[PDB]
Amino acid sequence: AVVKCKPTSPGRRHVVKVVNPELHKGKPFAPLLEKNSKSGGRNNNGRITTRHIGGGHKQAYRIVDFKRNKDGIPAVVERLEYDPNRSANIALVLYKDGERRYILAPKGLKAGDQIQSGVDAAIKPGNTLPMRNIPVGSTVHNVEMKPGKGGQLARSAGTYVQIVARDGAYVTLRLRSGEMRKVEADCRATLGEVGNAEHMLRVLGKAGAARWRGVRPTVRGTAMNPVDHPHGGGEGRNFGKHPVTPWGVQTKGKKTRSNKRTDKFIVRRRS
Amino acid sequence: EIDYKDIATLKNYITESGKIVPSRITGTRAKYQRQLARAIKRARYLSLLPYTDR
Amino acid sequence: SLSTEATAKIVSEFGRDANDTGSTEVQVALLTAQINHLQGHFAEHKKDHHSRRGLLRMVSQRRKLLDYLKRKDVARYTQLIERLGLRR
Amino acid sequence: MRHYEIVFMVHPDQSEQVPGMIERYTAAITGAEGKIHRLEDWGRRQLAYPINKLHKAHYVLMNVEAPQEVIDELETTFRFNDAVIRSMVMRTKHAVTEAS
Amino acid sequence: IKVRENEPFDVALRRFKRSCEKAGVLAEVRRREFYEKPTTERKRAKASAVK
RNA sequence: GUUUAUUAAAAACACAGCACUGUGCAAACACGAAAGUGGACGUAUACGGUGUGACGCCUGCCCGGUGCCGGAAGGUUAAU
RNA sequence: GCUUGAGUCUCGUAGAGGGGGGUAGAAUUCCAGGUGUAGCGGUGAAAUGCGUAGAGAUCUGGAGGAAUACCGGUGGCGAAGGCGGCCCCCUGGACGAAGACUGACGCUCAGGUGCGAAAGCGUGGGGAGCAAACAGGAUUAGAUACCCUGGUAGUCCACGCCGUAAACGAUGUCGACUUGGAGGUUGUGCCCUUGAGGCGUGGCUUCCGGAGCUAACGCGUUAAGUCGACCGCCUGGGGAGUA
Ligand SMILES: [Mg+2]
Ligand SMILES: [Mg+2]
Ligand SMILES: [Mg+2]
Ligand SMILES: [Mg+2]
Ligand SMILES: [Mg+2]
Ligand SMILES: [Mg+2]
Ligand SMILES: [Mg+2]
Ligand SMILES: [Mg+2]
Ligand SMILES: [Mg+2]
Ligand SMILES: [Mg+2]
Ligand SMILES: [Mg+2]
Ligand SMILES: [Mg+2]
Ligand SMILES: [Mg+2]
Ligand SMILES: [Mg+2]
Ligand SMILES: [Mg+2]
Ligand SMILES: [Mg+2]
Ligand SMILES: [Mg+2]
Ligand SMILES: [Mg+2]
Ligand SMILES: [Mg+2]
Ligand SMILES: [Mg+2]
Ligand SMILES: [Mg+2]
Ligand SMILES: [Mg+2]
């Protein structure tokens, strides 16, 4: 539920919060936790790469199951809980054999409903099975690039992929970006669309809201000196040149896709 | 009475192009015309009569 | 509308004897039952103003009769409004 | 009670699989309180217009009497079965016979 | 829509197309913009049709 | 809130918000002769770059120049 | 106290009444491919525009949006605005048959509350056609117009706001009385019932017309005729539905 904070003080006037009363207040399932080890944007050489990263919360990590290889063993969802490592919520699932795992949360998951994985399974949202036996024109959660590898596509809040064609040994998919891609028909995908679709409606508000998410301030190139950016220089706010990246590559255009190995599966590019 | 399976009579109220014949020409009553047209549309959906001869 | 079985049940419950359908008490009971039934229908959708109009019609009538009764037998009135739980 | 009249079509190739469908659906209908008053199949017959370039689909008509829940699951069975093409559900009709 | 004429057709005289609506539907449909027009195109001549 | 440690604390920087643009994952991009690492144990509701800078009402005309994107015609054109 | 006003109960009928979900055919556009080749398109006549980098026309496959061609009507439903493919779920109102029940429980309504075309505004989607603004080509003395070629917002969806129309029958609601004729739509009763027939009784609706009324036009049992209850509004034109 989207709620607008009252303008008590500067910093709360423009804060829009999302309330999810059906999440878990307690601590997460400990056996499925690990260390996260924030990096700050540095690589193994200690040099800054991907600037504007640093700080934030401790942010432990949850082991989420993406392979979804449990054939003929139905599971029931115990509860939904907040995951700080992604924009989507996760659901804890208990199988009939006494094993618990984490999965992504479809829209209408609620709680205490059976979930079937792999092989033959009902077409109800939540189940996972290969696309060789999924009707054309249906939304799915997270598609495997290769069979048995693990879902990679459409894993974010409120994202989904719909099948357009199945003829042949491949299947055509329309991704959220708006492009057609061919994927092997043996790849798995769970039905529905991952929930938490109210994600965009947040507004953060104050700068500390972005600061404690691990984002550092961004300094405009025009505000620098010519010695450290192709922009910058001159007295009195002059730009007079084509925009580029800090390393001299043109922005606002200049497509930068230079992969000649994956062009086979790109039926049509983004528009 | 006016069921959508009764093809062997519901042909008379359809022209050669699949058109429905008005009551002004047929001589039928108003309520009967309404239910007859509705049944014709239903049979047409269920693929008993053609939308058009094309 | 309401089911015949439910209507007969309410009539036999609130009327004095058989065929006592005109009594203000059975009128109130029927209107209250219909309103309570439509509460869920209008909780869902909530965009059906044409039916909400009939709901408001029902509400106005109940009120008008409940008043007639209170002007006749406060006794009866009080007991009824206690049985059906209303008139806050 | 609210009776229903179900009519459905099947792929022409699966002519030998229609009886299994009928005998399996009749069990589901009659499970709780269903009771069929008119069961019949026209079988093969040429269509009026080509549904994706198909012809001679099997027509199956049934007159059932069962609640909304069983009939809803039965209806979605058609939506998810690939052997069927179309479907129709009509009101009581007062259980007329034949009418072919 | 289709002509099925008997074996003797002379010079292929169109006798059944002429009797058919020919351009009944064609002329009926070739017009445009059927939104604000129909409300006012209504009978009232039928009324003038009288002894 | 930040800034010229030691003459400038500001109208300068940042900011939440907005827009454009690139990126289908072995992603773009960055460090690195390479291996490899970050981006990210993330997957377009995500990430990077650029400009503007709460909020309210708005953001007009010009593609001649430069840049960018697209184009089985034709002219010119390296190595061989 | 009573049952004739008002209302409840039983059995049926017709209807684009309203909300949600699903699905089908035609056509326009676009994408890929096949044959094919000099025009296409548009006008009063032209041009812009598209096409030899292969258009238009024609055939196959695919994507997507929107509206439901006749049926369809001096038809129907809704308090009004308004509501047309087909199917399912939820749901409101109206009318007919008698029978039973309550017993004036009614009419109107300042303030108040709700609904309320189109355009318009906010957030998020979608966007095939159409099309404000805008661009170009025409016409013209001039044309930021009528015409032509494109085309954004918008038109579509969900949730909110706006509360205005020649929102008109230019006619407030309720009740009673007052000659007729010809139709439509929807119930119902008696009968030689032979028939797509005779005789009656209700609801809604179109036209013509008597007395009466009206300045006249015209209204005329659905009154703008004769009366009763309440409400709203008017007091020369402009200024002004403005400060
Ligand atoms: Mg920024
Ligand atoms: Mg400087
Ligand atoms: Mg430089
Ligand atoms: Mg200057
Ligand atoms: Mg300058
Ligand atoms: Mg300060
Ligand atoms: Mg300092
Ligand atoms: Mg790496
Ligand atoms: Mg600035
Ligand atoms: Mg400024
Ligand atoms: Mg009632
Ligand atoms: Mg008022
Ligand atoms: Mg609008
Ligand atoms: Mg809008
Ligand atoms: Mg929009
Ligand atoms: Mg125009
Ligand atoms: Mg007004
Ligand atoms: Mg109107
Ligand atoms: Mg009018
Ligand atoms: Mg007026
Ligand atoms: Mg008259
Ligand atoms: Mg004013």
PDB file of all heavy atoms in Angstrom, chain G residues 166 168 170-171, ligand 20:
ATOM      1  P     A G 166     -27.786  24.701 -21.694  1.00  0.00           P
ATOM      2  OP1   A G 166     -27.461  26.133 -21.476  1.00  0.00           O
ATOM      3  OP2   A G 166     -28.042  23.823 -20.524  1.00  0.00           O
ATOM      4  O5'   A G 166     -29.058  24.625 -22.647  1.00  0.00           O
ATOM      5  C5'   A G 166     -28.987  25.068 -23.998  1.00  0.00           C
ATOM      6  C4'   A G 166     -29.517  24.024 -24.948  1.00  0.00           C
ATOM      7  O4'   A G 166     -29.995  24.672 -26.159  1.00  0.00           O
ATOM      8  C3'   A G 166     -28.506  22.973 -25.399  1.00  0.00           C
ATOM      9  O3'   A G 166     -29.162  21.716 -25.569  1.00  0.00           O
ATOM     10  C2'   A G 166     -28.049  23.505 -26.753  1.00  0.00           C
ATOM     11  O2'   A G 166     -27.535  22.526 -27.630  1.00  0.00           O
ATOM     12  C1'   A G 166     -29.339  24.122 -27.284  1.00  0.00           C
ATOM     13  N9    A G 166     -29.140  25.185 -28.272  1.00  0.00           N
ATOM     14  C8    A G 166     -28.388  26.327 -28.148  1.00  0.00           C
ATOM     15  N7    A G 166     -28.411  27.091 -29.213  1.00  0.00           N
ATOM     16  C5    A G 166     -29.238  26.408 -30.095  1.00  0.00           C
ATOM     17  C6    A G 166     -29.668  26.693 -31.402  1.00  0.00           C
ATOM     18  N6    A G 166     -29.311  27.787 -32.078  1.00  0.00           N
ATOM     19  N1    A G 166     -30.489  25.803 -32.000  1.00  0.00           N
ATOM     20  C2    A G 166     -30.849  24.706 -31.323  1.00  0.00           C
ATOM     21  N3    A G 166     -30.510  24.329 -30.093  1.00  0.00           N
ATOM     22  C4    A G 166     -29.694  25.235 -29.527  1.00  0.00           C
ATOM     23  P     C G 168     -32.498  19.770 -20.222  1.00  0.00           P
ATOM     24  OP1   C G 168     -32.089  21.116 -19.750  1.00  0.00           O
ATOM     25  OP2   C G 168     -33.179  18.842 -19.287  1.00  0.00           O
ATOM     26  O5'   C G 168     -33.438  19.967 -21.493  1.00  0.00           O
ATOM     27  C5'   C G 168     -34.615  19.185 -21.662  1.00  0.00           C
ATOM     28  C4'   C G 168     -35.081  19.183 -23.098  1.00  0.00           C
ATOM     29  O4'   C G 168     -35.190  20.556 -23.565  1.00  0.00           O
ATOM     30  C3'   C G 168     -34.152  18.474 -24.081  1.00  0.00           C
ATOM     31  O3'   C G 168     -34.921  17.856 -25.112  1.00  0.00           O
ATOM     32  C2'   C G 168     -33.336  19.624 -24.658  1.00  0.00           C
ATOM     33  O2'   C G 168     -32.772  19.370 -25.927  1.00  0.00           O
ATOM     34  C1'   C G 168     -34.377  20.738 -24.709  1.00  0.00           C
ATOM     35  N1    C G 168     -33.805  22.091 -24.662  1.00  0.00           N
ATOM     36  C2    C G 168     -33.838  22.901 -25.805  1.00  0.00           C
ATOM     37  O2    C G 168     -34.358  22.457 -26.839  1.00  0.00           O
ATOM     38  N3    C G 168     -33.303  24.143 -25.744  1.00  0.00           N
ATOM     39  C4    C G 168     -32.755  24.580 -24.609  1.00  0.00           C
ATOM     40  N4    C G 168     -32.235  25.808 -24.585  1.00  0.00           N
ATOM     41  C5    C G 168     -32.708  23.775 -23.436  1.00  0.00           C
ATOM     42  C6    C G 168     -33.238  22.550 -23.507  1.00  0.00           C
ATOM     43  P     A G 170     -38.608  21.276 -27.516  1.00  0.00           P
ATOM     44  OP1   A G 170     -39.677  22.198 -27.981  1.00  0.00           O
ATOM     45  OP2   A G 170     -37.663  20.691 -28.499  1.00  0.00           O
ATOM     46  O5'   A G 170     -37.761  22.039 -26.407  1.00  0.00           O
ATOM     47  C5'   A G 170     -38.404  22.816 -25.403  1.00  0.00           C
ATOM     48  C4'   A G 170     -37.434  23.268 -24.342  1.00  0.00           C
ATOM     49  O4'   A G 170     -36.415  24.089 -24.969  1.00  0.00           O
ATOM     50  C3'   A G 170     -38.046  24.123 -23.239  1.00  0.00           C
ATOM     51  O3'   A G 170     -37.341  23.918 -22.013  1.00  0.00           O
ATOM     52  C2'   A G 170     -37.819  25.541 -23.749  1.00  0.00           C
ATOM     53  O2'   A G 170     -37.786  26.530 -22.743  1.00  0.00           O
ATOM     54  C1'   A G 170     -36.473  25.410 -24.462  1.00  0.00           C
ATOM     55  N9    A G 170     -36.319  26.319 -25.600  1.00  0.00           N
ATOM     56  C8    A G 170     -36.818  26.128 -26.864  1.00  0.00           C
ATOM     57  N7    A G 170     -36.528  27.091 -27.701  1.00  0.00           N
ATOM     58  C5    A G 170     -35.781  27.975 -26.937  1.00  0.00           C
ATOM     59  C6    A G 170     -35.175  29.203 -27.249  1.00  0.00           C
ATOM     60  N6    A G 170     -35.231  29.766 -28.458  1.00  0.00           N
ATOM     61  N1    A G 170     -34.503  29.836 -26.265  1.00  0.00           N
ATOM     62  C2    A G 170     -34.450  29.266 -25.055  1.00  0.00           C
ATOM     63  N3    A G 170     -34.978  28.117 -24.640  1.00  0.00           N
ATOM     64  C4    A G 170     -35.636  27.510 -25.642  1.00  0.00           C
ATOM     65  P     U G 171     -37.717  22.685 -21.054  1.00  0.00           P
ATOM     66  OP1   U G 171     -36.977  22.851 -19.789  1.00  0.00           O
ATOM     67  OP2   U G 171     -37.568  21.432 -21.821  1.00  0.00           O
ATOM     68  O5'   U G 171     -39.262  22.915 -20.747  1.00  0.00           O
ATOM     69  C5'   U G 171     -39.683  23.619 -19.568  1.00  0.00           C
ATOM     70  C4'   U G 171     -41.130  23.319 -19.266  1.00  0.00           C
ATOM     71  O4'   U G 171     -41.928  23.563 -20.455  1.00  0.00           O
ATOM     72  C3'   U G 171     -41.437  21.885 -18.852  1.00  0.00           C
ATOM     73  O3'   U G 171     -42.565  21.839 -17.993  1.00  0.00           O
ATOM     74  C2'   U G 171     -41.870  21.259 -20.166  1.00  0.00           C
ATOM     75  O2'   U G 171     -42.709  20.137 -20.008  1.00  0.00           O
ATOM     76  C1'   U G 171     -42.670  22.405 -20.768  1.00  0.00           C
ATOM     77  N1    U G 171     -42.824  22.334 -22.224  1.00  0.00           N
ATOM     78  C2    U G 171     -44.012  22.778 -22.765  1.00  0.00           C
ATOM     79  O2    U G 171     -44.924  23.217 -22.089  1.00  0.00           O
ATOM     80  N3    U G 171     -44.091  22.691 -24.131  1.00  0.00           N
ATOM     81  C4    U G 171     -43.128  22.218 -24.993  1.00  0.00           C
ATOM     82  O4    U G 171     -43.353  22.205 -26.202  1.00  0.00           O
ATOM     83  C5    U G 171     -41.926  21.777 -24.356  1.00  0.00           C
ATOM     84  C6    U G 171     -41.817  21.850 -23.026  1.00  0.00           C
TER      85        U G 171
HETATM   86 MG    MG H  20     -33.625  25.894 -18.888  1.00  0.00          MG
END
